[PDB]
Structure 1
Amino acid sequence: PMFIVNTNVPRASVPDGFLSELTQQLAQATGKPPQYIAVHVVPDQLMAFGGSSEPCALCSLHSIGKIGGAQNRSYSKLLCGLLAERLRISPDRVYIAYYDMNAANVGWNNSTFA
């Protein structure tokens, strides 16, 4: 799985250990080994959410499987929770795009996962 967060929160507001926390929590949530989890945090961005430049985040979670209605609700609760606690972003100022990727459409290590 791959999780990306783009936010207007400044770099200094991102706590040390945040990438590790995301890795661990996503491994637990998705059930995938942490070795397969990649995380990418992009602070200091020029963004607006509903016209407002108050703290916000636009995120994506791509996974081969482990994506669906109930799972995505649970991921949203988890990830909005983390972004509220750690980055002080309101859950109602977060969007997360979920992508259920076909194994043949993910490249890794000179091949694909198919």
Structure 2
Amino acid sequence: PFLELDTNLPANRVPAGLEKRLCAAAASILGKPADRVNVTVRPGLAMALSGSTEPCAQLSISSIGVVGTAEDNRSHSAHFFEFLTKELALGQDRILIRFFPLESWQIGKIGTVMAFL
């Protein structure tokens, strides 16, 4: 899975090690091994969420197979919201998530594409 987190919290207000804890959490929530989880955190951005520039975060989650239905995504959403609200000290109105299914022909790995592996 690929997780990308944009936030307007400065880097020195994002708790140390968040990217590692998010990686471990995502492995458990999405049911994928941690060695297949990728996290990117981009702090210090200029953001508005729901029309407001108060602290916020945007998460994008992309994966093969497990983010393609409302039922799956509802379950994932609950856990990611709990993690981010408590780690970042944000209310639930200050986070949004987008989910994006991928297919194996779209992923370049070790100089080839996953569809051929």
Decide: shared fold, TM above 0.5.
yes
Matched, 1:25 2:25: yes
Other-structure match for 2:110: 109
Q: Deviations over 1:31-83 (max 9, x none)?
A: 11111100011111100012211111112100011112122112111111111
Structure 2 equivalent of residue 89 of structure 1: 90
**How many positions carry a matched residue from both structures?**
114
Runs of 4+ in 1 over 2 A off after TM superposition: none
Listed as ranges, the gaps of 5+ residues in structure 1 are: none
TM-score (norm 2): 0.91
Alignment root-mean-square deviation, CA: 1.1
In structure 1, what is the Cα distance between the partners aligned to 2:34 and 2:79?
Answer: 17
Aligned pairs for 1:1-114 within 5 A: 1-67=1-67, 68-114=69-115
Q: Which whole-Å CA distance do the structure 1 matches of 2:92 and 2:16 have between them?
A: 21
Q: Which runs of 5+ in 2 are unaligned?
A: none
Q: Secondary structure at the match of 1:9?
A: coil
- TM-score, normalised by the number of residues in structure 1: 0.93
Secondary structure of the structure 2 residue equivalent to 1:78: helix
